Amino acid sequence: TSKAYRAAAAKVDRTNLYTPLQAAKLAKETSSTKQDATVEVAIRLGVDPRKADQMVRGTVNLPHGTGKTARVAVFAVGEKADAAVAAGADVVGSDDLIERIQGGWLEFDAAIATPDQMAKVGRIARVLGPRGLMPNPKTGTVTADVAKAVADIKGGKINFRVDKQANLHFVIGKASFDEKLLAENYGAAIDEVLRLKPSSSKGRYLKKITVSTTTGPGIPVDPSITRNFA
């Protein structure tokens, strides 16, 4: 079924591995084919994530943005909030800002709080429960640099984390970008995964990689190319 999906499936080949340029060249021809969404990257690694020291986790600075609003409320006191309104955070307050969100307009994305204020801000998670806007050290939002970590959210620091079955599922941004501008994202993101190779990674490290949307099919990519994205 799905007559709009077979039309893209009668286009991309299975028995060929494409270049990173051709991968975004059909991602634009899938986001023209389908209704537009995020370009997904599924990396299949040669690690075993059941041993502890082969676990892969990290982030990436995409130089063309991940296509995200990044509305930030900053729960801090003193200059720590004042360094965030100068950073470019639109909703900046104090213990007052505890009150302005739990009653209404809980419309932001991250809450980077100081470790001294984690008690009173932690009750806002009772309305920020299913959306994960609570201050979290696991997302880089509880630290001593509560100011310029908002700028990490603005530019598109996408955190990755390998699953139980050695797969990195991963994004490069919205599909409204240029084809050569997606390979700038896609090039400077694989190399970030190449940074986090453990020494005990037996075998071939980046075995299989594919490029898909959340609406169209996947694209077979050649893992041989790690430098020549330009």
Partner RNA sequence: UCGGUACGGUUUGUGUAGGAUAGGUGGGAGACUGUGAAACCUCGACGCCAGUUGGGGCGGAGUCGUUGUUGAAAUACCAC
Partner RNA sequence: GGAGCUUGACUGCGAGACUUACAAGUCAAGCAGGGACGAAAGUCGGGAUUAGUGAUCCGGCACCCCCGAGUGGAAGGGGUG
Partner RNA sequence: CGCGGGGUGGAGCAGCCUGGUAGCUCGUCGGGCUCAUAACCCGAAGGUCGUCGGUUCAAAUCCGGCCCCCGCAACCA
Q: Where on the chain is the footprint of RNA (CB under 7 A)?
A: 1-5, 14, 34-35, 37-38, 40, 42, 44, 50-52, 129-130, 132, 161, 163-165, 167, 169-171, 208, 210, 212-218
d(Cα 58, Cα 55) in Å, to the nearest integer?
10
d(Cα 154, Cα 181) in Å, to the nearest integer?
18
Least distance in angstroms from the C-beta of 79 to RNA: 32
Is 113 within 8 Å of 77 (Cβ atoms)? no
Least distance in angstroms from the C-beta of 182 to RNA: 15
Task: Between 93 and 135, name the residue whose CB sits nearer to RNA.
Answer: 135
Task: Between 82 and 223, name the residue whose CB sits nearer to RNA.
Answer: 223
Least distance in angstroms from the C-beta of 76 to RNA: 25
**Measured in whole angstroms, how far is the alpha carbon of residue 210 from the centre of its chain?**
16
Task: Between 165 and 226, name the residue whose CB sits nearer to RNA.
Answer: 165
Task: Between 93 and 217, name the residue whose CB sits nearer to RNA.
Answer: 217
Least distance in angstroms from the C-beta of 155 to RNA: 16
Task: Between 83 and 177, name the residue whose CB sits nearer to RNA.
Answer: 177
Least distance in angstroms from the C-beta of 171 to RNA: 5
Helix (H, G, I), strand (E, B) or coil at 189: helix
Residues 6 or more apart in contact with residue 133 via CB below 8 angstroms: 106, 108, 109, 110, 111, 124, 125
d(Cα 74, Cα 135) in Å, to the nearest integer?
10
Cα distance from N-terminal residue to C-terminal residue, the chain: 38
Q: Hey, what are 225's tokens?
A: 């190319």
